[PDB]
Write a protein that binds this DNA or RNA. Structure first.
Lengths: 143, 49
RNA sequence: GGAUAGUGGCCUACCAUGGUUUCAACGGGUAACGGGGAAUAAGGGUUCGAUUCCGGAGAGGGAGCCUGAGAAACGGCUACCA
RNA sequence: GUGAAAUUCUUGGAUUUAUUGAAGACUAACUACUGCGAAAGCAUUUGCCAAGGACGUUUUCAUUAAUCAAGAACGAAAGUUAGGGGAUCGAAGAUGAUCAGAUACCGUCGUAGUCUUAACCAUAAACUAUGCCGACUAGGGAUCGGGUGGUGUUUUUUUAAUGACCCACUCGGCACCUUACGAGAAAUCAAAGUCUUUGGGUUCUGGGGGAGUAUGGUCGCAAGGCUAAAAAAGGAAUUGA
């Protein structure tokens, strides 16, 4: 009889049974309590603001390697420091110190030949203007 | 040699229902009425903060 | 009986001890205005609907009233708090 | 008495023999792939008290039923409280020997307990490691209980029981042997099956191992508060120089 009732007056039992087991599902619980954005990489937001502490890997020799691309920024709603990629050592010249970057996720699909694991954030804007605009020389970084 | 099989005994705690009720209050009871609305306003508010 | 435009524990007397509920009362949460409607999948469903129309509610927040057929009105008045 | 001995007790004669008497337990072989009970469980005889399955029935009421939280009954062994006796064995404990080997790690005594009455405790590998009720789907013999028929042998005859074996059929059990035109990961399964994707009724439940980490999520647990020390061939050696 497949465990469930089947009678034509059994909708009440069916409905309450399904309500209990819906609560016992996993993602339903997160979606109703509001904890998916507590499991999100840095809370709910899409991007995340930070202060550039130090440009790491400046004393490396071989250019355009990932340890040269890396920086170390501290997120401002946590006081919590974490690293971040910056493409193009030119853009590494653009980001110096006390800069208020806007990190975002990395979202890679495949690795590279010299990539660092666990560096999950990249830099989108610096001091209010976009890194790509600064690199393409559309704009100018205002101090 | 001998091959004496060993046996599983019982569980301790892997149930979503008791995982909810294990607080002093009821995590099932303290909930909301429009979870998708709550999700998109949480997104937008976190971005503005 | 009073009061109201009028029914009515609406309110005052004097009376009986009743009313709701495992068919979930009561109390809690709601980032809860309700609906026509919007999106999606094959069907079933699920999620949105502050927002061009309809209805209700409000005018910083308790409370109170004047005029008037119509208001507990706030681009009316009075006292309190902020 | 062990593998080996030793504590132990024996001229007031142990161990042994005979004749007994007392005590409290226990109910051997007979004992089965048999039986009873809702399960845990249940074995000497006889009697009493109630109860129950199954069969048989041209008896009787006429849906009175199935599944089901709450609660209730019962629940091995050990365990607790208060009584009883206390033979046997015996967690703790006290001891003997610590002998090579543990191949062949014990012995002696014994508190609680074992047993019994009255109350608690409510747990087991409490297992067919598998919710219940109903129905259908293979053959084969058995064995237990009841019944029907026949056939003889054992039986006995106006006395109080007319039972036993054989065979055929039949219900209802405990099981078993072959296999599935089925199912499956496969072992296997007469149900874990009911023609490819799904509806006979119904209660409960769900969304692997070790590791490494953080804990405000939590329960528990500690210590002391007069008390001190300062380099060697300046060797080895029945083996040397």
């Amino acid at each position: 009889g497949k465990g469930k009732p089947r009678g034509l007056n059994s909708a009440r039992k069916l409905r309450v049974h399904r309500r209990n087991n819906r609560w016992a599902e996993n993602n339903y619980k997160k979606r109703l309590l509001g904890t998916a954005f507590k499991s999100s990489p840095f809370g709910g937001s899409s991007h995340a603001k930070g202060i550039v502490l130090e440009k790491l890997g400046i004393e490396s020799k071989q250019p355009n390697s990932a340890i040269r691309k890396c920086v170390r920024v501290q997120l401002i709603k946590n006081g919590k420091k974490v690293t971040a990629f910056v493409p193009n050592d030119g853009c590494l010249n653009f980001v110096d110190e006390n800069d208020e970057v806007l990190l975002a996720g990395f979202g890679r699909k495949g690795k590279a030949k010299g990539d660092i694991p666990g560096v999950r954030f990249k830099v989108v804007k610096v001091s209010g203007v976009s890194l790509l605009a600064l690199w393409k020389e559309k704009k100018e970084k205002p101090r | 040699e001998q091959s004496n099989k060993q046996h599983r005994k019982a569980k301790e705690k892997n149930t979503a229902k008791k995982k909810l009720h294990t607080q002093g209050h009821n995590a099932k009871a303290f909930a909301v009425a429009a979870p998708g609305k709550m999700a998109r306003t949480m997104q937008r508010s976190s971005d503005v903060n």
